[PDB]
Design a protein around this ligand. Structure first.
Ligand SMILES: *[C@@H]1O[C@H](CO)[C@@H](O)[C@H](O)[C@H]1NC(C)=O
Ligand SMILES: *[C@@H]1O[C@H](CO)[C@@H](O)[C@H](O)[C@H]1NC(C)=O
Ligand SMILES: *[C@@H]1O[C@H](CO)[C@@H](O)[C@H](O)[C@H]1NC(C)=O
Ligand SMILES: *[C@@H]1O[C@H](CO)[C@@H](O)[C@H](O)[C@H]1NC(C)=O
Ligand SMILES: *[C@@H]1O[C@H](CO)[C@@H](O)[C@H](O)[C@H]1NC(C)=O
Length: 413
């Protein structure tokens, strides 16, 4: 039982918790965060850059346990850390937990960020497996690279992990992903671009905004990468595209279990800026029963600001996910930047489709903030959420992820 009523009472008490100590050291910038959680365990990643935010010094990928720290508040206890040999080659990591291991799928690139340099990326992927409870002298039990024998990608030129975390269904893992499709092969009817109440929107705007520029070589299509652990000695990776219902440019996404059923979140990196999430009807093919949410959006720039609904040509926005905490009433929780066109003012928010119930400001109105990743769970039968929030210090000119733990209150006063 949680508070189901709208209230201005400050019933949310966010607690500042803390994975690694380097996150705090002066002289290093911490970027490209990942946080994933399942079954009492977590996976975490960041890129460390000496000085500017840059020149990569170290990629860390670690796993551990989520535990009560001593005073009934959960925190993260790191258990097993891996450092890739060249931090300049590893991009877009994504984590799924299964049967005592976390599996982490990343892109390997000798040509930079594959999203920004798509035409030259080889499409190379790597899969690393990390024991959540390692063994002293555990060799290939503690950390192990898995051989990817084959990547099934259909009509797509390349496919890639794209989002912090996914789900397992038995022996099969599903990572959030994106497919690179040659723009000339994209099948789209401009009549489907919804411009009826949008006098300035051209019919072609949906189609042109399916890539990061209107004249891009590729369009981006979100979906899943399926990895079945029982599928022979070296399982294949299979791309599953998201359906064309409420289609938005392929963007960082998340699939997660909540209350026994999966939910899918897709970041709004274009003109469709109201929150894109909902229960998954089928995983393969991927169909999402998108919420008709009228209260949660995200900051952008001039053409696609917060609350924008009209088709425009734009590639802008921020990843601020939401986690379902009550299916019977469809109530969710996340951290959203309360601003129209600047990445500012992170607020922990509990909300329904057409109603914000209650909230708590995490910093100040002028606090610059960016990516937010929220996961909720039970601790002694009380609903807790942990949110990673990138806080940008404009004075210091440095981004650092902060971790907050918030108990969802039972009462409204
Ligand atoms: C982008 O791709 C080209 C392809 O050869 C490469 O030369 C260049 O290094 C890449 N740019 C960055 C910033 O990595
Ligand atoms: C294109 O889409 C519209 C959707 O209303 C449909 O009426 C039309 O028959 C479609 N066919 C085309 C563009 O070939
Ligand atoms: C995974 O692989 C096993 C063995 O081939 C098969 O029995 C099972 O149906 C597969 N599951 C999925 C979801 O593909
Ligand atoms: C959202 O709205 C559509 C109509 O555009 C409706 O068909 C669908 O059922 C609604 N989704 C919900 C309630 O999850
Ligand atoms: C932010 O955007 C909304 C919707 O267009 C508008 O109502 C509101 O006035 C804007 N806020 C500010 C502070 O300009």
């Amino acid at each position: 039982n949680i508070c189901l009523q709208k209230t201005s009472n400050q019933i949310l008490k966010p607690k500042l918790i803390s994975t690694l100590p380097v996150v705090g050291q002066s002289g290093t910038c911490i970027t490209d965060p990942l946080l994933a959680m399942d079954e009492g365990y977590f996976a975490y990643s960041h890129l460390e850059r000496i000085g500017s935010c840059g020149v990569s010094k170290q990629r860390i990928i670690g796993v551990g346990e989520v535990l009560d720290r001593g005073d009934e508040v959960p925190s993260l206890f790191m258990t097993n850390v891996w450092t890739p040999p060249n931090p300049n080659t590893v991009y877009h990591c994504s984590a799924v937990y299964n049967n005592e291991f976390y599996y982490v799928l990343c892109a390997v690139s000798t040509v930079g960020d594959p999203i920004l340099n798509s035409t030259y990326w080889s499409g190379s992927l790597m899969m690393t497996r990390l024991a959540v409870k390692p063994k002293s002298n555990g060799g290939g039990y503690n950390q192990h690279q898995l051989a990817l024998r084959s990547i099934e990608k259909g009509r797509y030129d390349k496919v890639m992990p794209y989002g912090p975390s996914g789900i397992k269904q038995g022996d099969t893992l599903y990572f959030p992903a994106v497919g690179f499709l040659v723009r000339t092969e994209f099948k789209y009817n401009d009549s489907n671009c919804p411009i009826t109440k949008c006098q300035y929107s051209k019919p072609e705007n949906c189609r042109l905004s399916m890539g990061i520029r209107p004249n891009s070589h590729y369009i981006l299509r979100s979906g899943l990468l399926k990895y079945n652990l029982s599928d022979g000695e070296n399982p294949k990776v299979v791309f599953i595209e998201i359906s064309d219902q409420r289609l938005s440019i392929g963007s960082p996404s998340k699939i997660y279990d909540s209350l026994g059923q999966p939910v899918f979140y897709q970041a709004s990196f274009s003109w469709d800026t109201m929150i894109k999430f909902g229960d998954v009807l089928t995983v393969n093919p991927l169909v999402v029963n998108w919420r008709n949410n009228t209260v949660i959006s995200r900051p952008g720039q001039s053409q696609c600001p917060r609350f924008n609904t009209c088709p425009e040509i734009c590639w802008e926005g921020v990843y601020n996910d939401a986690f379902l905490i009550d299916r019977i009433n469809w109530i969710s929780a996340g951290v959203f930047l309360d601003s129209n066109q600047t990445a500012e003012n992170p607020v922990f928010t509990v909300f329904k489709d057409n109603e914000i119930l209650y909230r708590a400001q995490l910093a100040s109105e002028d606090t610059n903030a960016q990516k937010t990743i929220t996961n909720c769970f039970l601790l002694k039968n009380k609903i807790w959420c942990i949110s990673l929030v990138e806080i940008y210090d404009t004075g210091d000119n440095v981004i650092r992820p902060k971790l907050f733990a918030v108990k969802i209150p039972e009462q409204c006063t």
